[model samples]
Target: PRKMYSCAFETTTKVEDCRVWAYGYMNIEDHSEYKIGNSLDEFMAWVLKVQADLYFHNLKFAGAFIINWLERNGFKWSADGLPNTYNTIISRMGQWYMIDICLGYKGKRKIHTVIYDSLKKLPFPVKKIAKDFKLTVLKGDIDYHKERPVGYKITPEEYAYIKNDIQIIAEALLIQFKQGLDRMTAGSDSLKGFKDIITTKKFKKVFPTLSLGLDKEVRYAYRGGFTWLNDRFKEKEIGEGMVFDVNSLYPAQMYSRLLPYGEPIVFEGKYVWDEDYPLHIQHIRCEFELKEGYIPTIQIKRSRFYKGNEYLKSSGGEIADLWLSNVDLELMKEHYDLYNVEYISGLKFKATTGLFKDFIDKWTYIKTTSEGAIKQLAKLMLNSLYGKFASNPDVTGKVPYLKENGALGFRLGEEETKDPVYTPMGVFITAWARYTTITAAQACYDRIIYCDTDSIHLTGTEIPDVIKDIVDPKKLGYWAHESTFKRAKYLRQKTYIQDIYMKEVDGKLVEGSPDDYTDIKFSVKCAGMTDKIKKEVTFENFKVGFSRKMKPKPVQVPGGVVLVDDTFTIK
Candidate 1:
């Protein structure tokens, strides 16, 4: 007890009194050997071995942890961790851990699952050893440096003179990581929102290339390893297929660093986006430059990201609150387009999904189904813990399509307080059909990249006669997934799932499901649609036309009753 304390043993001071009190509770003899150099060391060896063993009853979490482990390893237990499922299968790392401590002294760590199934009592072999260790071990401990405080300023200059000036490996890593992301982001942004041809042309013409253009954020590259072999990340071999990106983990953690410009410019005492001399902070708004060989000149080395708690530091799997995000390999080619992902149709589509699916199954050592269930399960694992979302009130004051009086100056408060017909985003919602054809749209502004569920990344570009082109069938225009409050409203006992929305472009939409139907067998649906001319039917017309089909028999459930007695009920 308190053995690590400094050697200044004292009988008189308050610190000694506390140490004696701790020793008394420990119930172990000092044996006149105030410090036992040998026997005490041996006792500690046995205690730590048992602590690492989770077969003990007190260490278990709500069945969630074990269920997850089981699902990952093919719903079975073995020393190797997997059931020999495929040519490439995710390893069961956790089960192997449990099995190791169980069989440490013997060939098998004898745990009786039957005892747990009956819920009566534990089995004999493990119970006696657990009780014996309880008397031998002590839980006394104190932890320091457990919490961190915000608003605590850190000045690197304060510690500069304390050590020899050093340019560390971490510093070098940052330089390389930044280079790769800068080059990649330039290449990726160029192709982000080529919704149609006009936006595509504007992007290539306005900004040709980045001095170092590439998407810099880290991504996965598979690497294999095993504990018995004392092997870690094997990047050079084929078995080491995983490449985890830890490149962004520490270096790019500064969020405020991403303002319009890298330097501070005061506007009314607040920072405006400007890069002043000597600061040399890279401006966020600066366009990419065409480097030699049309390749980014910056040299960047990739780092493997571990399973850590930071976002952006993670590549895909561990990263939370995203529908889906993956590195588009072709993103680096000049003017490479994401809308052209439609070009990756058919068997190639399944292959892309399969590659991503395979990586997730093995890397975290979890169960991954051939049906994408494993990936879905892992997503819910991180999402349920950290998922969040929000929406701002519609700013309908500026768009004329939202209201008859709307203009650049037509504020919402200036209007007579009355019912309004639509919203600005809703204007884009409803007139999506009319303004969708080539003739109605006058010009293209910029390509909007939906990077996450609620996140939008806009690339600056001016489309040639893009907005007007949307009005005519021959030209492409802005489109949206039509949203409506009602789905099965025509039925007497209508039910709603989620607000229905369909993706559309130039009057035609991709997954344009109508009402309760999601398939093409219905007169209206969203998937696999190619023609805009047949897509202009109004919701009101569809409702009227399908009134008979929409109606349904009422199987009434009892309405909620607020009154407990007849006296409280209305006549």
Candidate 2:
């Protein structure tokens, strides 16, 4: 039940473990346990815990660090005694201080003489050393029967507890080992383009490195610009069975590379009442098959021609209203769930049923619960997006005097639009709308729901001809020529495709878009998504949040004393 099987529209076992191979130990009498990191979040959590309880052993924490180091250092596993390669690598790059400390230390650490000599002066005090170390050093041993002639007697191997401070150092070593190993394997052995930017002659001549321990990133924010949503604009040139890496960033983001836009097609296209407008919707519905993985993720706005005004309507159009309820999260979960569960049908269902099911349910449910809330919120989202119409000149509630009366403040010094959008409602809606658009755009876009912003997602995949005879697009034409489109057309038509809306965007999954339109938007993805966990576990030895509903591990002894011996062995 704790498994996040729902991630890829199905349950995957790989999602269970935080790391590659999870192993640790637990105590039967006193429950005590430890684990390494899965993500940065998990790692920080563990560090904070150690800071809180000084004596905590935090067992099992050693294995991953060691593994990371070993893997990094390119150390191979050996079934027999310690391998020579391990020692050779260690001798070359390892800091001898640790080796010396280990050599001087007790427990199994005493086994290696070369390692023992590295310790100059032990960090722990000699008298009652374990007491000063903030950890209990228990004397323990393991017995193994030796197979030999009758004269041979089996000997027991003793195991002693390690100090917590020493354990922390072990983690550091592991990290180092892993990093070293990774460096050796990184890129090609050929030392091209591998120069240290700070020290390189060319790099120094060009620019000086300022930051330490961090790679610089260039971040640019673009808004209100003309963009090409699909970088490969020649949709007509697309071959059948063509597959594009839709997630390779947005089209506008790749403007200089793949998408080269010409001057705007400045056609003064007006929403002439198309008696056959249904033809447009019909053509698109039949073209693209929406899949879960193919969903469009809209984060920024751009176009080929010019920045267009936000097209949100007076009423929080259908899609906008649905977004305000925050029910889209559920809709997405449900949509993806179906894609995951039923294998055969799920395949075909991706574009049509799967895509539509998610957002429509979100819209429907939200509509059912908060009709008024959605309308007000939708207006706020649309206003901000299209018109930059958000202002509180009167300051209303903040002004105190305005709150006493039904009349409110102003917008840009003028009387506020008589919309029911409250300040908090507007703020919540604006954030919610952007969130949904980015999160849900993929599915609808895959379905050829062409362009979408704010409250509405538009689909123009259905062109004029080859329209399905069953659905009538004419009735839906009202959404096409809505005054907003007419107005935009008066300014410039070529950039504006048939300004559209869907009566019920959800209905498209069944009745295919008619010439008529209403309002709503959604995104889709690939026909079939590789079912797996979406989490990125970039590190170990770190613990952030508990993904587990239950954490059944060892219970630390009172006063942080170990009555039982400590072994990194864990399950």
Candidate 3:
């Protein structure tokens, strides 16, 4: 019913619409006549040269193409408009089933998992049309969008945008090329192969800092993050609060000139490396009896990462922690019994002001005002540089490492691809950034209701000066109050619903934005059970039995007065 006009184009106008052709019917085979043509014809050609190796890169191209094709085919594309990221819809069996045309490269024969193999029961028209085109009919769930599917259309005239998009991406890759940060093209072997290029001397001369020269390690066991008040709600009749956030916290760290510089020198056995270097990591075997302490660990999945702390004991010592960095060891030393601090050798580099500051500054400024591609380009460059470093070397593909002797040529073929590696400094830089956030969170613990890495949900009469001090770009990197709400209503960390309201000005209430309130309404549909004849059914000790009778016990908040059923209280 919703897609009356749109249905005409996809099913009636053409013998086999682009949707059907996009994914060939039940019987797929290799042949010249069954060509991958039209818009896809051009996109496939472009993507081949563009190198859709990275998962994100593949999505970018796929999304762009799928959206454009769906729109061109006259079906309205729904990306986020629907419950899930379903691309297009078709009226079938008295209702519309969202169709997701999942695509992959040539020879990579696979469709989306959301779609199933059973197609015989599809509406007769679709089946006949699909059979006529030798295309497979789809039948499956449009389930969820934890993973995004690319299918929305670019208008006809805007179709010219494809070339510009491709150019923008290609140029972004070349930025990595010029900076010698080409991780997509080369692996760790590439960086290791050319130690001369990846050195601190080269980085300092090439990219200078934006801030002053006084660089020091703030905390030894520093990991930049903020997590406090796991499951607690500070409820008031009229509770008020603000959620503060740092603008591009990591990028700000990058631009603020707070990172390691110089070639990393390895310090081996029994050394307590405390030279105040900007970037350093020490694998020290320290004697500090483990007594239930937290240590951070990283689990890398492709380009993204998942980080958390785990509890463990020392490998061969009284230490409660295993695999301690100098920072970790230093923090533990203050609280526990410490001795025999043997350094098991690790990398340390001279700290610099900001290695990627210039690039970060330029892009950060441009992104603030620019729109469309320019803003996107600026934002992409600023964040992606960190992403390149944070990329898991273990899971990623071959890097395009440059040939030695300072040439733009690659070191050729599968033979040279052996033994991939990543820089330790990158890891140190990231850890330092995290440490920065952690330090800030600890300082504002008095006022913090909750914290999740870069932002904090603050609960106080007014924002603390210390909170303002750390977030201030001048005094420190600085954080900003993003918005305020009537009540935070905390359930747990990362899982709470707020009754958001606009922050007030001198007198009048400020206008609300799209995400300022909870749209999800909660209600209990069933209140009590039906009184049946067999109120309690039972058959002895080994009997099948069931019995229940009660109105749902009305639950309440603090200080009496039953409010509602199914209320949860955090102990």
Per-residue C-alpha lDDT of model 1 across residues 197-313, encoded as one tens digit per residue = 235454244222312111111011111110010012111111101001111111111111111111112122212223231111111111222222221111112234432211121
Error of 2 at 193 (Å): 7.4
Q: Give candidate 2's TM-score.
A: 0.18
User: For candidate 2, what is the lDDT?
Assistant: 0.23
Q: Candidates' TM-scores?
A: 0.17, 0.18, 0.47
- Collision count for each candidate, in order: 49, 83, 26
Question: After best superposition, candidate 1 residue 429: deviation in angstroms?
Answer: 32
After superposition, the stretches of candidate 1 with alpha carbons farther than 4 Å from their true spots are: 1-329, 335-571
CA lDDT of 187 in candidate 2? 21
Instruction: Provide the overall lDDT of each model, using Cα atoms, as 2-decimal numbers.
Output: 0.20, 0.23, 0.38
Candidate 1, run of 10 with poorest lDDT: 3-12
The order by descending lDDT is 3, 2, 1
1-571 per-residue lDDT for model 2 (tens digits): 0100000000012212122221122211122343322232233233322211111122122222332333334343332224221221122212122111111224443322111110111222222233432334444322222222322322222211122323432332223232221122112111111223123464233222322211111001112211223322212222111111121122112111111111111112221223322111000000111234443222212343223343211211111101111122233333332221211100000011121123223333443465432432222221222111122222221110111222111112222222211122222223333333444344434433223332222233332232222123223111121211210110121122222223545445221233444642221122111122112211131122313222222222211111122222111
Candidate 3 whole-model C-alpha lDDT, 0 to 1: 0.38
